Amino acid sequence: SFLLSKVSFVIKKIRLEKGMTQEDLAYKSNLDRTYISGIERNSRNLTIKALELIMKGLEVSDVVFFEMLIKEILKHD
Amino acid sequence: SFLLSKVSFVIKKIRLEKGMTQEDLAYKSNLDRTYISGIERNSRNLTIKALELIMKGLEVSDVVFFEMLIKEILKHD
C-alpha cells in the first residue's frame, strides 16, 4: 500500500539525510542489517517497537518522523 | 515506553469515540479479538500492516491517527 511504501521511504530518506549506511543504522537501532534492508523494501511487518528503535538509531524524534510521514501522505496520496 | 503506551491509547480512544467494542474492531480490522485486546494493552509487537488494518476498521485516516498521536506525545511527554 501507499502507507507501507511511505513508511519505508521516510526511514530511507532520513537515514540518507544523516549520511548513514544500512549497516550504521543496524548497529545504532539494535536491529540487524538484513532486517533494516527488508524494512526499507517493505515495512509490512515492521513493529512499533522496531520503529522506535530505528527513530532512536536515526536520532530523530517520533514527532518529526510522523510529521514527515503525514507530509508525504498529504502531498502524494 | 511512552510511544508504545500512546499508540495503544490513541487506538482505544478512537475506538470508544466511534462507539465500537473490541469485538466490533476485530471484525472490521480482520484481526482477532485477543490481538486487538493485546495491542490495546501493549503495542510493542503491533506491525505497520496491522495498524493500517485497524485505521481502516476504525474508518479513520492514517493522517488523523498520526496527528492525534503527535498531539498526545507533544502535550504529555
PDB file of C-alpha atoms in Angstrom:
ATOM      1  CA  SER A   1       0.000   0.000   0.000  1.00  0.00           C
ATOM      2  CA  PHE A   2       0.899   3.694  -0.201  1.00  0.00           C
ATOM      3  CA  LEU A   3       1.309   3.868   3.669  1.00  0.00           C
ATOM      4  CA  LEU A   4       3.672   0.817   3.751  1.00  0.00           C
ATOM      5  CA  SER A   5       5.708   2.279   0.912  1.00  0.00           C
ATOM      6  CA  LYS A   6       5.924   5.737   2.516  1.00  0.00           C
ATOM      7  CA  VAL A   7       6.966   4.399   5.986  1.00  0.00           C
ATOM      8  CA  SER A   8       9.976   2.676   4.191  1.00  0.00           C
ATOM      9  CA  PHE A   9      10.516   5.767   2.101  1.00  0.00           C
ATOM     10  CA  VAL A  10      10.674   8.145   5.137  1.00  0.00           C
ATOM     11  CA  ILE A  11      13.114   5.765   7.038  1.00  0.00           C
ATOM     12  CA  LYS A  12      15.442   5.593   3.981  1.00  0.00           C
ATOM     13  CA  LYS A  13      15.162   9.381   3.407  1.00  0.00           C
ATOM     14  CA  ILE A  14      16.114  10.306   6.925  1.00  0.00           C
ATOM     15  CA  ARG A  15      18.868   7.687   7.025  1.00  0.00           C
ATOM     16  CA  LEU A  16      20.470   9.161   3.788  1.00  0.00           C
ATOM     17  CA  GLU A  17      19.972  12.738   5.096  1.00  0.00           C
ATOM     18  CA  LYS A  18      22.035  11.732   8.121  1.00  0.00           C
ATOM     19  CA  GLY A  19      24.730  10.163   5.859  1.00  0.00           C
ATOM     20  CA  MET A  20      24.174   6.674   7.388  1.00  0.00           C
ATOM     21  CA  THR A  21      24.554   3.396   5.671  1.00  0.00           C
ATOM     22  CA  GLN A  22      22.178   0.471   6.336  1.00  0.00           C
ATOM     23  CA  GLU A  23      24.999  -1.128   8.413  1.00  0.00           C
ATOM     24  CA  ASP A  24      25.314   2.140  10.555  1.00  0.00           C
ATOM     25  CA  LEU A  25      21.538   2.210  11.196  1.00  0.00           C
ATOM     26  CA  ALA A  26      21.537  -1.512  12.054  1.00  0.00           C
ATOM     27  CA  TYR A  27      24.217  -1.049  14.682  1.00  0.00           C
ATOM     28  CA  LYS A  28      22.571   2.098  16.143  1.00  0.00           C
ATOM     29  CA  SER A  29      18.924   0.662  16.160  1.00  0.00           C
ATOM     30  CA  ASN A  30      19.910  -2.768  17.620  1.00  0.00           C
ATOM     31  CA  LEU A  31      18.323  -4.437  14.558  1.00  0.00           C
ATOM     32  CA  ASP A  32      20.380  -6.487  12.154  1.00  0.00           C
ATOM     33  CA  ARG A  33      21.337  -5.264   8.713  1.00  0.00           C
ATOM     34  CA  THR A  34      19.040  -7.749   6.764  1.00  0.00           C
ATOM     35  CA  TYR A  35      16.121  -6.505   8.914  1.00  0.00           C
ATOM     36  CA  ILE A  36      16.854  -2.841   8.053  1.00  0.00           C
ATOM     37  CA  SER A  37      17.271  -3.820   4.357  1.00  0.00           C
ATOM     38  CA  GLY A  38      13.992  -5.755   4.440  1.00  0.00           C
ATOM     39  CA  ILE A  39      12.005  -2.900   6.146  1.00  0.00           C
ATOM     40  CA  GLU A  40      13.255  -0.344   3.647  1.00  0.00           C
ATOM     41  CA  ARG A  41      11.957  -2.646   0.807  1.00  0.00           C
ATOM     42  CA  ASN A  42       8.619  -3.400   2.555  1.00  0.00           C
ATOM     43  CA  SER A  43       7.522  -2.123   6.041  1.00  0.00           C
ATOM     44  CA  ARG A  44       4.506  -4.539   6.288  1.00  0.00           C
ATOM     45  CA  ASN A  45       5.993  -6.455   9.247  1.00  0.00           C
ATOM     46  CA  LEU A  46       7.938  -3.600  10.917  1.00  0.00           C
ATOM     47  CA  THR A  47       6.640  -3.410  14.556  1.00  0.00           C
ATOM     48  CA  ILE A  48       6.052  -0.190  16.574  1.00  0.00           C
ATOM     49  CA  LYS A  49       8.973  -1.287  18.870  1.00  0.00           C
ATOM     50  CA  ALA A  50      11.342  -1.760  15.889  1.00  0.00           C
ATOM     51  CA  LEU A  51      10.180   1.640  14.515  1.00  0.00           C
ATOM     52  CA  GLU A  52      11.017   3.279  17.906  1.00  0.00           C
ATOM     53  CA  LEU A  53      14.484   1.657  17.820  1.00  0.00           C
ATOM     54  CA  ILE A  54      15.004   2.943  14.247  1.00  0.00           C
ATOM     55  CA  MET A  55      13.911   6.534  15.244  1.00  0.00           C
ATOM     56  CA  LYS A  56      16.396   6.290  18.094  1.00  0.00           C
ATOM     57  CA  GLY A  57      19.231   4.977  15.800  1.00  0.00           C
ATOM     58  CA  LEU A  58      18.415   7.857  13.351  1.00  0.00           C
ATOM     59  CA  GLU A  59      18.398  10.298  16.317  1.00  0.00           C
ATOM     60  CA  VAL A  60      15.098  11.648  15.003  1.00  0.00           C
ATOM     61  CA  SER A  61      12.206  12.335  17.348  1.00  0.00           C
ATOM     62  CA  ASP A  62       8.953  10.321  16.882  1.00  0.00           C
ATOM     63  CA  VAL A  63       7.156  13.597  16.352  1.00  0.00           C
ATOM     64  CA  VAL A  64       9.390  14.589  13.397  1.00  0.00           C
ATOM     65  CA  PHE A  65       9.145  11.137  11.842  1.00  0.00           C
ATOM     66  CA  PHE A  66       5.378  11.100  11.957  1.00  0.00           C
ATOM     67  CA  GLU A  67       5.212  14.726  10.619  1.00  0.00           C
ATOM     68  CA  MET A  68       7.396  13.785   7.648  1.00  0.00           C
ATOM     69  CA  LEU A  69       5.092  10.710   7.080  1.00  0.00           C
ATOM     70  CA  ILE A  70       1.883  12.892   7.170  1.00  0.00           C
ATOM     71  CA  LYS A  71       3.513  15.352   4.688  1.00  0.00           C
ATOM     72  CA  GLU A  72       4.390  12.574   2.266  1.00  0.00           C
ATOM     73  CA  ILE A  73       0.785  11.067   2.535  1.00  0.00           C
ATOM     74  CA  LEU A  74      -0.928  14.539   2.111  1.00  0.00           C
ATOM     75  CA  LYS A  75       1.279  15.698  -0.814  1.00  0.00           C
ATOM     76  CA  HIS A  76       1.481  12.395  -2.671  1.00  0.00           C
ATOM     77  CA  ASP A  77      -1.541  10.203  -1.994  1.00  0.00           C
TER      78      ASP A  77
ATOM     79  CA  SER B   1       7.744   3.323  26.617  1.00  0.00           C
ATOM     80  CA  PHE B   2       5.639   6.482  26.313  1.00  0.00           C
ATOM     81  CA  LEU B   3       5.291   5.954  22.469  1.00  0.00           C
ATOM     82  CA  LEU B   4       4.107   2.302  22.881  1.00  0.00           C
ATOM     83  CA  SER B   5       1.626   3.375  25.534  1.00  0.00           C
ATOM     84  CA  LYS B   6       0.289   6.289  23.460  1.00  0.00           C
ATOM     85  CA  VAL B   7      -0.150   4.197  20.243  1.00  0.00           C
ATOM     86  CA  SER B   8      -2.440   1.828  22.339  1.00  0.00           C
ATOM     87  CA  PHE B   9      -4.050   4.817  23.981  1.00  0.00           C
ATOM     88  CA  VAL B  10      -4.930   6.542  20.642  1.00  0.00           C
ATOM     89  CA  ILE B  11      -6.368   3.231  19.161  1.00  0.00           C
ATOM     90  CA  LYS B  12      -8.575   2.715  22.268  1.00  0.00           C
ATOM     91  CA  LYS B  13      -9.612   6.414  22.291  1.00  0.00           C
ATOM     92  CA  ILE B  14     -10.734   6.451  18.702  1.00  0.00           C
ATOM     93  CA  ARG B  15     -12.432   3.066  19.045  1.00  0.00           C
ATOM     94  CA  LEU B  16     -14.519   4.353  22.078  1.00  0.00           C
ATOM     95  CA  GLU B  17     -15.233   7.662  20.263  1.00  0.00           C
ATOM     96  CA  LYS B  18     -16.755   5.597  17.464  1.00  0.00           C
ATOM     97  CA  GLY B  19     -18.813   3.545  19.993  1.00  0.00           C
ATOM     98  CA  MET B  20     -17.067   0.272  18.962  1.00  0.00           C
ATOM     99  CA  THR B  21     -16.355  -2.662  21.137  1.00  0.00           C
ATOM    100  CA  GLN B  22     -13.112  -4.668  20.835  1.00  0.00           C
ATOM    101  CA  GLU B  23     -15.169  -7.409  19.078  1.00  0.00           C
ATOM    102  CA  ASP B  24     -16.521  -4.781  16.502  1.00  0.00           C
ATOM    103  CA  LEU B  25     -12.979  -3.525  15.763  1.00  0.00           C
ATOM    104  CA  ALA B  26     -11.692  -7.108  15.443  1.00  0.00           C
ATOM    105  CA  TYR B  27     -14.303  -7.961  12.844  1.00  0.00           C
ATOM    106  CA  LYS B  28     -13.788  -4.684  10.909  1.00  0.00           C
ATOM    107  CA  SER B  29      -9.870  -4.783  11.005  1.00  0.00           C
ATOM    108  CA  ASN B  30      -9.597  -8.515  10.073  1.00  0.00           C
ATOM    109  CA  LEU B  31      -7.615  -9.092  13.301  1.00  0.00           C
ATOM    110  CA  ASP B  32      -8.913 -11.356  16.023  1.00  0.00           C
ATOM    111  CA  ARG B  33     -10.314 -10.054  19.277  1.00  0.00           C
ATOM    112  CA  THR B  34      -7.359 -11.308  21.502  1.00  0.00           C
ATOM    113  CA  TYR B  35      -4.983  -9.466  19.124  1.00  0.00           C
ATOM    114  CA  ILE B  36      -6.937  -6.185  19.474  1.00  0.00           C
ATOM    115  CA  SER B  37      -7.090  -6.711  23.280  1.00  0.00           C
ATOM    116  CA  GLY B  38      -3.348  -7.409  23.391  1.00  0.00           C
ATOM    117  CA  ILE B  39      -2.406  -4.323  21.248  1.00  0.00           C
ATOM    118  CA  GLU B  40      -4.512  -2.015  23.389  1.00  0.00           C
ATOM    119  CA  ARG B  41      -2.580  -3.311  26.494  1.00  0.00           C
ATOM    120  CA  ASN B  42       0.858  -3.127  24.788  1.00  0.00           C
ATOM    121  CA  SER B  43       1.543  -2.063  21.129  1.00  0.00           C
ATOM    122  CA  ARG B  44       5.205  -3.321  21.153  1.00  0.00           C
ATOM    123  CA  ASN B  45       4.531  -6.028  18.535  1.00  0.00           C
ATOM    124  CA  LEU B  46       1.775  -4.271  16.525  1.00  0.00           C
ATOM    125  CA  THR B  47       3.022  -4.171  12.864  1.00  0.00           C
ATOM    126  CA  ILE B  48       2.532  -1.265  10.395  1.00  0.00           C
ATOM    127  CA  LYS B  49       0.216  -3.602   8.352  1.00  0.00           C
ATOM    128  CA  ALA B  50      -1.926  -4.423  11.428  1.00  0.00           C
ATOM    129  CA  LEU B  51      -2.022  -0.672  12.276  1.00  0.00           C
ATOM    130  CA  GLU B  52      -3.280   0.086   8.708  1.00  0.00           C
ATOM    131  CA  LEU B  53      -5.992  -2.587   9.110  1.00  0.00           C
ATOM    132  CA  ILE B  54      -7.007  -1.060  12.476  1.00  0.00           C
ATOM    133  CA  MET B  55      -7.173   2.508  10.952  1.00  0.00           C
ATOM    134  CA  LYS B  56      -9.356   1.033   8.228  1.00  0.00           C
ATOM    135  CA  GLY B  57     -11.633  -0.824  10.756  1.00  0.00           C
ATOM    136  CA  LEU B  58     -11.905   2.478  12.749  1.00  0.00           C
ATOM    137  CA  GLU B  59     -12.644   4.332   9.467  1.00  0.00           C
ATOM    138  CA  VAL B  60     -10.032   6.895  10.492  1.00  0.00           C
ATOM    139  CA  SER B  61      -7.487   8.182   8.002  1.00  0.00           C
ATOM    140  CA  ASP B  62      -3.756   7.480   8.668  1.00  0.00           C
ATOM    141  CA  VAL B  63      -3.192  11.211   8.682  1.00  0.00           C
ATOM    142  CA  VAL B  64      -5.703  11.796  11.521  1.00  0.00           C
ATOM    143  CA  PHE B  65      -4.340   8.891  13.544  1.00  0.00           C
ATOM    144  CA  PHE B  66      -0.783  10.118  13.341  1.00  0.00           C
ATOM    145  CA  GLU B  67      -1.891  13.736  14.146  1.00  0.00           C
ATOM    146  CA  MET B  68      -3.699  12.542  17.274  1.00  0.00           C
ATOM    147  CA  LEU B  69      -0.503  10.546  18.216  1.00  0.00           C
ATOM    148  CA  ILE B  70       1.776  13.651  17.736  1.00  0.00           C
ATOM    149  CA  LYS B  71      -0.654  15.739  19.883  1.00  0.00           C
ATOM    150  CA  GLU B  72      -0.597  13.202  22.697  1.00  0.00           C
ATOM    151  CA  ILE B  73       3.312  12.987  22.554  1.00  0.00           C
ATOM    152  CA  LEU B  74       3.733  16.856  22.437  1.00  0.00           C
ATOM    153  CA  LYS B  75       1.192  17.601  25.222  1.00  0.00           C
ATOM    154  CA  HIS B  76       2.076  14.725  27.535  1.00  0.00           C
ATOM    155  CA  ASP B  77       5.679  13.617  27.101  1.00  0.00           C
TER     156      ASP B  77
END
